[PDB]
Amino acid sequence: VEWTDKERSIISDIFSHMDYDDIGPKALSRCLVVYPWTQRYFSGFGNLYNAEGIMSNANVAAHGIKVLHGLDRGMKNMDNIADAYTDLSTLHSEKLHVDPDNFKLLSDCITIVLAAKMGHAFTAETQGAFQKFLAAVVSALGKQYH
Amino acid sequence: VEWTDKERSIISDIFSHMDYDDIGPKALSRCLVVYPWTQRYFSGFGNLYNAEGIMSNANVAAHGIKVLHGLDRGMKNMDNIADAYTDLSTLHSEKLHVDPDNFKLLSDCITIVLAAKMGHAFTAETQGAFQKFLAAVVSALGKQYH
């Protein structure tokens, strides 16, 4: 949508210091237990049976890191995020058949994990900028569903 | 944005035969009984005490007939619904202090009342275009909130 310079810098900061290797596994892990229905999409991933099992599941660590990177295009073309997700939207709908509501659930986990990591740095102004960015990306992910 | 010609016609069809003096009162009353918290904004309206009383409250009727006409600009300004309601948004936000969640609830009530009326002719496809239009209107109404 329309971005203020502040949001641009806030978004720029967060990604600059993001430990994709730490946030990604933990954000995807937290999603799989907090919203167990999301497990269906990861049939071959192995142990998704309880908290422990998800928490130490290699398939999930690696994929979370991946999921988080998927955002990278967005903040890298902040004025063209919808178009930037044309393909993934198509991938997610027609190839993977993923209920886009999960986009919002995982977005929320990502937000909750970034907050644990950033602590006091996760100010209200930072939460707003991050959620705004994520909502925009979520909209873009479910564009191609028809 | 973006409307198929079909959607354009359906909306024009719907409004062409819309009995505002009938649908309007019925939509706002139903909203006030199923989502009673919306009764808060109609304090000067008088008797809200029960369903019957809401159903036969003239002030509610006249205001419902009015709210539905509010939609008129949107349907006559289909490719610019954001801009068309910017003022109304501000009115609802800064003057009336209306919780924009009730915008979705009322669209729902409107939607279901028109459905009672149009009956079997209220097809899935017709519903989809009316909800789409109603959605854009609801988006346009809550933009000026900050």
Place this chain on the structure above:
Amino acid sequence: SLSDKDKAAVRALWSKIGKSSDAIGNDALSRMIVVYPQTKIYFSHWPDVTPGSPNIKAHGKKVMGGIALAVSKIDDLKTGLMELSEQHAYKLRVDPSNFKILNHCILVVISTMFPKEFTPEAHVSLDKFLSGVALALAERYR
């Protein structure tokens, strides 16, 4: 939660419209996949991902079958629908947000079909009830 008043209203409406459960179900699910295409993912393994389908006829049937049961189990949905909860839970794994979508489509259909009977009083009690069923369907999710 549902008051006695809510329980009565739901029971009265259903004794009035229950006969048409089959039309309501086909119509409701058909609407669902039309107005909310994203819900099609749960059926992307079916040879009729379109309205009035044999499977849309089927699932619609079973869904209104749950509604009939939920009414009979209106005094304790959680206990009355646990079995259903696990099918959609561990088995089907449907995001609960879709229940709100279906519930909405069911009120539109009933309205299209029984406008005299679907008064606002019946609507609110029914809305309340369908929220109760969905939450009941979600019992075994996490």
Place this chain on the structure above:
Amino acid sequence: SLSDKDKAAVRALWSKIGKSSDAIGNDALSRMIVVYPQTKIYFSHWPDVTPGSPNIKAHGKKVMGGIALAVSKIDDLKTGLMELSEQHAYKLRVDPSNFKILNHCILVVISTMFPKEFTPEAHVSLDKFLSGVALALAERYR
């Protein structure tokens, strides 16, 4: 519904973080008015819709007091929060949708403040609990 495990998980977390109930409330409501400004309307009877404000610090204090109450009443929230429901109902008339928004702000604050304590397990149970609370606060609305 909250399982024993859920009731256990919420109780343990609240015994661990309860000391900071005052800070959690101020921070949560501040976040709410900043990130979801539309919620400001309910407080528009004050020209003071800002984080860490005396009026903001206060309500938050009262909010977390209601949350500690709900923990103490965790075995029956519906009964435990009748009074609380009545206030936001007939009096304030808060759209029940804002409870969800506040709940999210509450999880973020706790996340920022107790990162070791806020495990996913404590998350799922706390999240389940706050939806229970939300549904409890809505009991007298309709």
